Enzyme design. Sequence first.
Site, PDB file in Angstrom:
ATOM      1  N   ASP A   1      -3.335 -10.701  -1.995  1.00  0.00           N
ATOM      2  CA  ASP A   1      -3.898 -10.099  -0.794  1.00  0.00           C
ATOM      3  C   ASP A   1      -5.320  -9.650  -1.104  1.00  0.00           C
ATOM      4  O   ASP A   1      -5.620  -9.272  -2.237  1.00  0.00           O
ATOM      5  CB  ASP A   1      -3.040  -8.916  -0.330  1.00  0.00           C
ATOM      6  CG  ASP A   1      -3.446  -8.389   1.034  1.00  0.00           C
ATOM      7  OD1 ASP A   1      -4.543  -7.804   1.161  1.00  0.00           O
ATOM      8  OD2 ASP A   1      -2.651  -8.541   1.984  1.00  0.00           O
TER       9      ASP A   1
ATOM     10  N   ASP B   1      -5.255 -12.561   4.017  1.00  0.00           N
ATOM     11  CA  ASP B   1      -6.523 -12.147   4.594  1.00  0.00           C
ATOM     12  C   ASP B   1      -7.709 -12.614   3.747  1.00  0.00           C
ATOM     13  O   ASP B   1      -8.862 -12.363   4.094  1.00  0.00           O
ATOM     14  CB  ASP B   1      -6.561 -10.628   4.780  1.00  0.00           C
ATOM     15  CG  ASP B   1      -5.712  -9.891   3.766  1.00  0.00           C
ATOM     16  OD1 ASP B   1      -5.417 -10.468   2.697  1.00  0.00           O
ATOM     17  OD2 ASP B   1      -5.347  -8.728   4.034  1.00  0.00           O
TER      18      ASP B   1
ATOM     19  N   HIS C   1       0.811  -1.220   0.000  1.00  0.00           N
ATOM     20  CA  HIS C   1       0.000   0.000   0.000  1.00  0.00           C
ATOM     21  C   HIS C   1       0.843   1.270   0.000  1.00  0.00           C
ATOM     22  O   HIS C   1       0.337   2.352  -0.291  1.00  0.00           O
ATOM     23  CB  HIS C   1      -0.945   0.025   1.202  1.00  0.00           C
ATOM     24  CG  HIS C   1      -2.025  -1.005   1.137  1.00  0.00           C
ATOM     25  ND1 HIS C   1      -2.925  -1.070   0.097  1.00  0.00           N
ATOM     26  CD2 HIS C   1      -2.346  -2.016   1.979  1.00  0.00           C
ATOM     27  CE1 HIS C   1      -3.753  -2.079   0.298  1.00  0.00           C
ATOM     28  NE2 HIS C   1      -3.425  -2.666   1.434  1.00  0.00           N
TER      29      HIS C   1
END
Length: 354
Positions: free
Chosen positions: A167, A260, A130
């Site tokens: 992800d 996740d 990110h």
Amino acid sequence: SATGTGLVYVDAFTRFHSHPECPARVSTVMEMLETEGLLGRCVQVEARAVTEDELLLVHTKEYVELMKSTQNMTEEELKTLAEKYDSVYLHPGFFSSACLSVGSVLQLVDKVMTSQLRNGFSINRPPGHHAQADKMNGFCMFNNLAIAARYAQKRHRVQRVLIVDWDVHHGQGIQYIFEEDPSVLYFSVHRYEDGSFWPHLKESDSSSVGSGAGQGYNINLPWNKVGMESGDYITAFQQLLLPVAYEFQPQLVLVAAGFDAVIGDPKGGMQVSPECFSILTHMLKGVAQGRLVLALEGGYNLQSTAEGVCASMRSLLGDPCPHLPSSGAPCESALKSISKTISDLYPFWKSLQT
Ligand SMILES: CC(/C=C/C(=O)NO)=C\[C@@H](C)C(=O)c1ccc(N(C)C)cc1
Ligand SMILES: [N+]
Ligand SMILES: [N+]
Ligand SMILES: [Zn+2]
């Protein structure tokens, strides 16, 4: 023939922190790796601190200095600065960990590209996908893989780098960095829900295919329904990513390996079996002569993340692919998203044209 699987982990990864992104993420991954007997089968690789010049391959000089000065800041100065970023906390030792987190992947890139190792996996926090050239974002200070991608290009003369981001969150950081760059192909499979899922960006849809010479070299596939399974990701890889991958012909594959999206993760909302990541990993081994490096990103259920890492590790070690508990047939919502993305990058890739 290169052999061996590199594993980078250092206790320093546990020296910064209700919060989901915690040192518990990395410590219990290493513990499950040991008890599963996977750790002793890896070649343990030393970590190293990233240098300034390496950081400047991706991040601005002003941003690097601001991040360096965070070491001596008061917990109120860290509070002020972090509040000016999206979903980011700061800690006196964040900079050191972030520096060792980047260098951990650089260590693995060196060993894989010099054929000392076949592949590798850095169990590193903080995550990176990110982080952007001049700002912190989504618990990321520096962009681990973006730095590693251009590092391999400069130091190891790599022409083309493929980055796969499985992800559950869209790595807009990586997308922004290589937006105009055709030498690095970015693929991101992520939960979107038409912008209602974090980071709530319109740039996270399949419409964003890059710009300039980079047009076609940015691939986003957005899920718009929760509860996706192994059959959805495998179909996505088989019909989209891998056709493009072999046409692209990268010489190094980097994986933003967040977990996740595994079943039971509080943040992801998906139902991807841990064993699925053994398959996805194995698929990517058929690319770039197996030159494959994975780096930890997200994943917030301690056991589910550890399982995802272990499952990915077994394939890195060349162990037989596991049985899949879930069906091999993808759902209609997944097919819709896969079709939409394929349609958006249709004119850029010959292999997508059927
Ligand atoms: C950014 C992120 C994970 C990204 C990831 O995993 N990328 O791979 C999760 C966000 C939505 C989140 O859940 C959150 C929680 C607490 C918080 N504060 C207490 C400030 C701010 C944000
Ligand atoms: N992603
Ligand atoms: N790109
Ligand atoms: Zn995530």
